[PDB]
């Protein structure tokens, strides 16, 4: 038996440590720590309900927006207010271009330098790399010039002796299997990445502010005012600017990012066998289009034992037996309160009391769904839509498919996706989804307006006396979000944040039970112990985000 | 050519002071850590991780003693022993002083490191504070915002790296480009202000036609800042007041993170 | 897909009127062409010339009677039967008023074609009037400013096109979304006018901080435009008073090209 | 034999009318006419000298810039004002940047669609198109992916059945000689050339307030205030700015727009031995760099009789030689005064009487030099470098014709480049050699302002007596312009322009000389004398701008 310790794990938001007891090369035991703790829970608490959205959005600034949203959504619930249509379109707009943003830099800056070797990029031969890609891609920037311009880059930053951000990396490891010419591309492809995120944030930004950290929602609605004849405001000019930007995004998102995702999993083709994290998923639905916070775009569900077939659909954010079924525990986390909690009745005490195997070892609580442990985010969200039947989401997995079996000669199979391959897959394919999300919704807007409604907000009352309780639910890029707020004499008494990144990395729970990156690890080879570049193959794969998970 | 060295730490941070570098456009992120500076140890792009990681952050503290650019952000909590955030086994504090021991300029990005910001409002959990409380011996350059335009940062290591100083500061250490004026002293809705006409709520006949959100909560009357003429994303009209919302004051230290979004300014 | 047909007649031009799409970004130029409109006529950019081009703006009239939009850049010239500005062998006067029997929306772009502009100034040596004037019968949309950013012209024929008519219009024709409000009456320099901080000359310690340009003669005070708020070329923070030069009130009739660049404006 | 009439010339500045005599095929006698006067000497005589620039800058929208320099030039030559060298550095990166969008926009948008025929693109392979330009551009944007991207959009258009400013063009003509492939690559070109002029045009804007009509000049410097440490004005964020756009002209002009040139001359050879309009040449230098309006980056000077040799530089717009030869007549003119008059004695006096072949026949005046007709712009530009030996024009010129040499197996000698040919050659060398001046600039400015010079204006004073006179000089786009002020008792008394396009399109002078236009069309072959392609080929080779050439 050897112990080993990764910390900080990088290319993730926020602050992680992942110990392993490793067993003659193969991960038998696995901790996931989250080191930094603020209190944004605490924080927040005794403030008028209105004010809370701009101080919990600061939770996350990699996911920026989603706080945000949460915390409206979760204060509309304790008053019960109906947000009106144009508020719901514009916050839509918003969180797909984020969301757009959020997984092509996870996939390129953050998870690409685990699969993709630059050192070996320079001995690509430039027009064999542009070969390769001959009916695989129509992507107008995959030309050998492209390529010689970007391999004469890395060669000027390694004759330069001054590699930085790219110095003591895994190059050579024997788990790094690209060709060359596919390094090549892929570097070519991660520069390429920057510019289509930049086009998603110009969305963003245009409706929100700014970004990071927007600043046009309320409680009741958004801040923009819609008039089409007016100066200073949203007029016809500024929403041409807004569709300028939405359609720029496609041609990436299709030709380069759903490509690049195929041929990953034809060069590792082991990774379809490994990091399965749970047999339960867990997914809210989103964007939401009638005046009564629901009639939404995309689908929710529960899928328990990996049974597709048996799943139970959820189509709103106020069902009772998804807010009924979920609790979190501390018992193995530096938090005084062990026992179960729903999160209407949460506690967060800090008990910090050092590093113990058995005892407690993060700042993550660990959240159980009618006391079973859940996989969220876009494997989870998939799947849900897969059981659903949503034609979209079959043909699009389907796309990434045919370019697999074009490379392989092999099909691809639901098994194969409770994985960390599937996992990335699912993140593709959801960042695909979103374009559409987008068209949809800029053309209801335009349409609404037409129509004579140009409104945006409901004012809020908020009862001096009397306690009262909300939630709001969100499917972000990283999973479900809820936020869950007890209001009492008019501020806020009670306030709890259960995070997509808590249901994944949350240690050891009340009963032991072991949650998805602490599951995911056990079985990973590790070729060099002083080097384990298999087991952040696997935590990548489940977009770490630690301000998140802790808070 | 040798380009200028950089090294990067967050304390209890959101990382979103690091994603206003995604947003710039003079220098793009790629052209800042190819041919402006080298970035020698940044956690959210490093290609190294754990122990390979922590030697490339020694080496380079070793290579370029007395030459490089420390920036952090996030506040520093100093509550039970430094133990609220923790690092290969160690309390940031010991990290951060470290490094500040060998550094030719330390900036404190956001208004977390500049003053504490979000993370040490309310009852303070963590007892976080600034990058100048744990550095007393040192002059730290605050660029504060939540987060700032990523150029408030970039133009002031341009003015170290072209002319060999730090840009002009106020009695706050902060950059007069940047942070010389209140933003109600240079805002494009002054004149509406002037002649009392106010948006009374969201959605109302004045705020549909681009009048002074002063009677929403506006704090750009005790705020300093540039957000009404830099403004943000470089797209052109785009800050909170030109979108139709207040500004928060989250520039400044005791607006920001304390004083309700609702609350009226006082006026100068 | 059929798109919406648009034929452009220059009269007296400078072509600035045109130049100005060439910066434009939603749309830029070439969507603009290929996909939101069809150019039928435009003498700048047509592949045909001479007899092939006047066959083809005859054919188009016809073919789409009672559709099109019609667009005058340029003053129009009535001195001596017409005679100074002759294309084709005939007074424009005559090419103009012929496109305008069948058009579905007449739009004067520029302050030439708005109000006569520079080109009517002075002595006004050709009897140069504006497209109203040769116009009477007609509604004529005026867009001026010399050029307008050409996202008021852009955003006036998506209105069209979208929404099936024009867009609000003020007592001159012009839309209110650009024009509806005075530059002074949303300028970003109205705190140091209220408190008395001027520039006296270009260069000295005030123009040097960013202070109110009204000595150094600016319109703003009496001249309706976008121009503080949409500013120019989408790059963000530019058009004439942030880069350091009063407004000369190009947009608006009387102001512009009669009165002196130093000359004082009159406040409200 | 037979007369046509061209008329309206399109894909120029203004209102232009060609007329020729055709005789066995080939043009014998041409007029060429400007057919709209607006009178702008009229409009700005009598005011104070310091507000002529914003009036006079109206000239023209398509050499925006150009007027407004050359009058707050005149306006300090007469009352005798050094400019601050930051103001220098400052009209110096404007008319460089300018003069960059102005080019393109003329070899793309005004120009190719004489060349090029777009049905022909068509028919072509998208693989062979890009596998033609293999070793002979860098350039990153010319896949067989680009170029099938850009086939469906004009497959799209035709099938439509709305060409629009497309339709009823020169689709087949005999004179139409490049291959389906190439037709392509230049359809591609085009669309590519609107991105570069566009960020070209951002960097006027970022120093000049907006662009058309920048507005940031004055008597005595410039209205940009330096402080590197001021909010609200010229600081080191907005100069990193400016240089953001200055870094992104570069590959376009020398991967793409220098290629064309050298790939047009190949497939139309003949081109270099017709189009021929004077032997005689002018320049004057551009760029001053010195505290005293002078010393010059680009050189000036006179070529007589076509004698590199034997030429005489000029190096001052002092030059006392320049000032005392140029006059203009308006014998075939429709003004009232017809004896030759130097510009400070000028009159401006409409006299239209209407068309005559050997009477007044044009609004356009007829300049001369000490007697004789000269021809200006991009052609004299090269021709006067080339004659001061000049080493960066020199090697410009040999990179097109290494690209000739490489497509034909036959070089170029500098005779041939007195043809409609050779005039494109030189506005091409021009364009590629600006962006050095770009670089120049940007780095001088930078380095004064670190030095502790701040400065930008020096306030003028105007005595309320005595009679002054000045002259400012420019090389515009299209060639030599100059301003000439006369100030009477403190306000303008008389204004002259001399604009480039004046001396090239002027009608038949006091003598009877013919000027470039007309003689360049001399023994023009003209297959379709109802379609005279050819006659348009020439003309349009001078960039016609009839708002300059009338005013
Ligand atoms: S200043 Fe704001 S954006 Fe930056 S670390 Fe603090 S909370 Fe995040
Ligand atoms: S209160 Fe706010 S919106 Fe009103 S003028 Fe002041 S800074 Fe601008
Ligand atoms: S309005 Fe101005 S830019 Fe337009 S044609 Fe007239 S002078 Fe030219
Ligand atoms: S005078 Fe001009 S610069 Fe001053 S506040 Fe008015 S519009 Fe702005
Ligand atoms: N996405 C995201 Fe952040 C996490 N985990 C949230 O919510
Ligand atoms: N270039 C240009 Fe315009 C002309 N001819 C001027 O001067
Ligand atoms: S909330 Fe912050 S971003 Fe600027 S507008 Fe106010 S200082
Ligand atoms: S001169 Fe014209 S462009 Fe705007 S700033 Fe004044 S109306
Ligand atoms: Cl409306
Ligand atoms: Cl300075
Ligand atoms: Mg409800
Ligand atoms: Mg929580
Ligand atoms: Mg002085
Ligand atoms: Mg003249
Ligand atoms: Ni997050």
Same mark, same amino acid.
């Given at each position: 038996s050897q112990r080993i310790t990764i910390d900080p794990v990088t290319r993730i938001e926020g602050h992680l440590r992942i110990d392993c007891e490793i067993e003659?090369?193969?991960?038998?035991?696995?901790?996931?720590?989250?080191?930094?703790?603020?209190?944004?829970?605490?924080?927040?608490?005794?403030?008028?309900?209105?004010?809370?959205?701009?101080?919990?959005?600061?939770?996350?600034?990699?996911?920026?927006?989603?706080?945000?949203?949460?915390?409206?959504?979760?204060?509309?619930?304790?008053?019960?207010?109906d947000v009106p249509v144009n508020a719901q379109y514009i916050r839509n707009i918003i969180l797909a271009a984020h969301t757009t943003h959020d997984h092509i830099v996870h996939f390129y800056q953050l998870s690409a330098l685990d699969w993709v070797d630059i050192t070996s990029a320079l001995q690509a031969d430039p027009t064999k790399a542009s070969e390769m890609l001959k009916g695989v891609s129509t992507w107008h920037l995959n030309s050998p010039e492209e390529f010689t311009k970007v391999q004469n880059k890395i060669?000027?930053?390694?004759?330069?002796?001054?590699?930085?951000?790219?110095?003591?990396?895994?190059?050579?490891?024997?788990?790094?299997?690209?060709?060359?010419?596919?390094?090549?591309?892929?570097?070519?492809?991660?520069?390429?990445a920057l510019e289509c995120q930049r086009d998603a944030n110009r969305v963003v930004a245009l409706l929100g502010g700014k970004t990071p950290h927007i600043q046009n929602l309320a409680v009741g609605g958004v801040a923009n005012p819609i008039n089409l004849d007016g100066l200073?405001?949203?007029?016809? #000019?500024? $929403?041409?600017?807004? !569709?300028?930007?939405?359609?720029? *995004? &496609?041609?990436?998102?299709?030709?380069?990012?759903?490509?690049?995702?195929?041929?990953?999993?034809?060069?590792?083709? #082991?990774? $379809?066998?490994?990091? !399965?994290?749970?047999?339960?998923? *867990? &997914?809210?639905?989103?964007?939401?289009?009638?005046?009564?916070?629901?009639?939404?775009?995309?689908?929710?569900?529960?899928?328990?034992?990996?049974?597709?077939?048996?799943?139970?659909?959820?189509? &709103?954010?106020?069902?009772?037996?998804?807010?009924?079924?979920?609790?979190?525990?501390?018992?193995?986390?530096?938090?005084?309160?062990?026992?179960?909690?729903?999160?209407?009745?949460?506690?967060?005490?800090?008990?910090?009391?050092?590093?113990?195997?058995?005892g407690k070892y993060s700042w993550v609580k660990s959240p159980t769904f009618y006391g079973k442990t859940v996989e969220v985010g876009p494997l989870a969200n998939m799947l849900v839509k897969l059981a659903a039947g949503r034609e979209s989401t079959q043909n699009k997995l389907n796309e990434i498919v045919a370019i697999y079996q074009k490379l392989t000669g092999?099909?691809?199979?639901?098994?194969?996706?409770?994985?960390?391959?599937?996992?990335?897959?699912?993140?593709?394919?959801?960042?695909?989804?979103?374009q559409d999300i987008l068209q949809n919704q800029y053309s209801a807007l335009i349409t609404n307006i037409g129509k004579g409604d140009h409104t945006t907000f409901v004012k809020p009352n908020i009862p001096a006396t009397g306690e009262f309780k909300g939630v709001g639910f969100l499917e972000a890029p990283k999973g479900m979000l809820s936020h869950w707020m007890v209001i009492k004499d008019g501020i806020i008494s009670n306030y709890q944040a259960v995070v997509p990144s808590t249901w994944n990395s949350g240690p050891r729970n009340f009963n032991d039970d072991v949650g998805p990156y602490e599951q995911s690890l056990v079985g990973t080879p590790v070729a060099d112990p002083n080097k384990p570049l298999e087991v952040v193959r696997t935590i990548h794969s489940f977009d770490p985000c630690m301000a998140c998970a802790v808070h | 050519?040798?380009?200028?060295?950089?090294?990067?730490?967050?304390?209890?941070?959101?990382?979103?002071?690091?994603?206003?570098?995604?947003?710039?456009?003079?220098?793009?992120?790629?052209?800042?850590?190819?041919?402006?500076?080298?970035?020698?140890?940044?956690?959210?792009?490093?290609?190294?991780?754990?122990?390979?990681?922590?030697?490339?952050?020694?080496?380079?503290?070793?290579?370029?003693?007395?030459?490089?650019?420390?920036?952090?952000?996030?506040?520093?909590?100093?509550?039970?022993?430094?133990?609220?955030?923790?690092?290969?086994?160690?309390?940031?504090?010991?990290?951060?002083?470290?490094?500040?021991?060998?550094?030719?300029?330390?900036?404190?990005?956001?208004?977390?490191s500049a003053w504490g910001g979000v993370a040490a409002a309310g009852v303070n959990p963590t007892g976080a504070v600034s990058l100048q409380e744990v550095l007393p011996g040192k002059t730290v350059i605050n660029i504060p915002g939540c987060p700032p335009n990523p150029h408030n940062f970039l133009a002031t290591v341009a003015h170290i790296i072209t002319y060999g100083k730090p840009?002009?500061?106020?009695?706050?250490?902060?950059?007069?480009?940047?942070?010389?004026?209140?933003?109600?002293?240079?805002?494009e809705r002054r004149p509406h202000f002037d002649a009392g006409?106010?948006?009374?709520?969201?959605?109302?006949?004045?705020?549909?036609?681009?009048?002074?959100?002063?009677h929403l909560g506006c704090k750009g009357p005790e705020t300093y800042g540039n957000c009404s003429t830099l403004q943000f994303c470089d797209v052109g009209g785009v800050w909170p007041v030109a979108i139709g919302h207040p500004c928060y004051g989250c520039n400044e230290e005791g607006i920001g993170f304390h004083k309700g979004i609702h609350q009226l300014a006082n006026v100068e």
């Open positions: 003659n090369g193969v991960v038998s035991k696995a901790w996931a720590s989250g080191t930094m703790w603020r209190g944004m829970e605490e924080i927040v608490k005794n403030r008028d309900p209105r004010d809370a959205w701009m101080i919990v959005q600061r939770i996350c600034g990699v996911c920026t927006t989603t706080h945000a949203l949460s915390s409206v959504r979760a204060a509309e619930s304790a008053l019960n207010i060669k000027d930053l390694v004759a330069s002796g001054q590699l930085g951000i790219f110095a003591n990396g895994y190059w050579g490891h024997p788990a790094m299997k690209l060709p060359p010419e596919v390094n090549l591309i892929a570097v070519a492809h991660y520069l390429q200073g405001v949203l007029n016809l #000019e500024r $929403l041409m600017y807004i !569709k300028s930007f939405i359609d720029k *995004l &496609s041609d990436f998102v299709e030709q380069v990012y759903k490509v690049d995702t195929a041929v990953i999993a034809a060069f590792y083709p #082991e990774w $379809l066998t490994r990091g !399965k994290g749970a047999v339960n998923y *867990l &997914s809210v639905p989103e964007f939401p289009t009638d005046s009564k916070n629901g009639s939404f775009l995309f689908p929710g569900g529960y899928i328990e034992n990996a049974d597709l077939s048996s799943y139970r659909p959820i189509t &709103s954010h106020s069902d009772e037996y998804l807010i009924k079924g979920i609790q979190e525990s501390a018992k193995h986390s530096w938090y005084k309160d062990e026992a179960p909690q729903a999160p209407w009745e949460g506690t967060t005490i800090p008990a910090y009391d050092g590093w113990s195997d058995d092999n099909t691809l199979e639901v098994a194969q996706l409770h994985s960390t391959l599937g996992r990335i897959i699912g993140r593709t394919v959801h960042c695909c989804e979103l | 050519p040798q380009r200028p060295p950089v090294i990067w730490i967050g304390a209890q941070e959101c990382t979103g002071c690091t994603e206003s570098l995604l947003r710039a456009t003079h220098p793009t992120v790629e052209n800042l850590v190819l041919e402006t500076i080298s970035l020698e140890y940044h956690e959210v792009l490093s290609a190294a991780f754990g122990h390979q990681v922590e030697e490339n952050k020694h080496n380079a503290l070793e290579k370029y003693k007395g030459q490089y650019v420390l920036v952090v952000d996030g506040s520093i909590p100093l509550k039970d022993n430094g133990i609220y955030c923790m690092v290969a086994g160690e309390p940031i504090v010991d990290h951060i002083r470290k490094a500040a021991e060998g550094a030719a300029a330390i900036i404190a990005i956001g208004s977390c840009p002009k500061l106020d009695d706050k250490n902060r950059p007069t480009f940047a942070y010389g004026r209140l933003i109600h002293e240079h805002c006409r106010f948006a009374k709520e969201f959605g109302d006949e004045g705020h549909r036609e681009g009048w002074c959100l002063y």
